[PDB]
């Protein structure tokens, strides 16, 4: 549903997470993020123009959303187990996924 908007959704919900008060909020943000990541994973960034879905760049692109959903799952667990700050920290550790893709395909 538009790659810009998917990316806005991940960004945004990182902020709510840092600012959050209780796991239920954090739980909801990570939900939004996960869906965003799966939707984004289906799109074609401008730099990957006329690259066939079997190209390494488009494989690598889709791959990058896979590691990230993993780490979002791994953080959601902490959420459902009431463990806020540790999930608020796991969330921070997600910026490792953000940087790597961007530097390649933004
Ligand atoms: C590739 C597998 C990506 C990962 C993982 C993340 N981002 Fe991304 N982002 C990606 C691309 C290819 C682009 C450019 C889209 C375009 O319109 O050119 C972006 C852009 C953003 C932006 C800017 C959005 C805007 O208003 O134009 C933001 C704020 C952003 N991305 C955030 C973001 C965060 C917070 C991520 C980790 C949780 C993250 N992205 C991962 C590609 C990829
Ligand atoms: Ca746009
Ligand atoms: Ca924008
Ligand atoms: Ca928008
Ligand atoms: Ca905004």
Buried b / exposed e across 46-64, counting CB within 10 Å, b at 16+?
eebeeeeeeeeebeebeeb
- Please tell me the total count of domains within the chain: 1
Residue range of the domain that includes 12: 1-106
Record the tokens describing residue 48, joined without a space.
């990957």
102 is in an annotated binding site: yes
Using CB distances shorter than 6 Å, the residues near ligand 1 are 3-4, 7-8, 10-11, 14, 45-46, 61, 64-65, 68, 94, 97-98, 101-102, 105-106
Residue pair 6/36 in contact (Cβ under 8 Å)? The answer is yes
The DSSP code for 106 is -
DSSP H helices, the chain, are 3-18, 23-40, 56-80, 84-92, 95-105
Tally the residues of the chain. Answer: 106
> At how many Å resolution was this determined?
2.8
- Name 9's Cβ contacts closer than 8 Å, sequence gap at least 6: 32, 33, 35, 36
Tell me if residue 99 falls in helix, strand or coil. Answer: helix
Query: What does the block give as tokens for 106?
Result: 């933004």
Q: Whose CA is nearest to atom 25 of ligand 1?
A: 4
**Is 67 annotated for ligand binding?**
no
**Experimental approach taken:** X-ray
């Amino acid at each position: 549903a538009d790659l810009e908007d998917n990316m806005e959704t991940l960004n945004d919900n990182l902020k709510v997470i840092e600012k959050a008060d209780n796991a239920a909020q954090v739980k909801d943000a990570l939900t939004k993020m996960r869906a965003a990541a799966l939707d984004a994973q289906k799109a074609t960034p401008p730099k990957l123009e006329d690259k066939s879905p079997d190209s390494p760049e488009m494989w690598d692109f889709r791959h990058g959303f896979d590691h990230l959903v993993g780490h979002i799952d791994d953080a959601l667990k902490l959420a459902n187990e009431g463990k806020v700050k540790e999930a608020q920290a796991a969330a921070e550790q997600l910026k490792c996924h953000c940087n790597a893709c961007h530097q390649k395909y933004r």
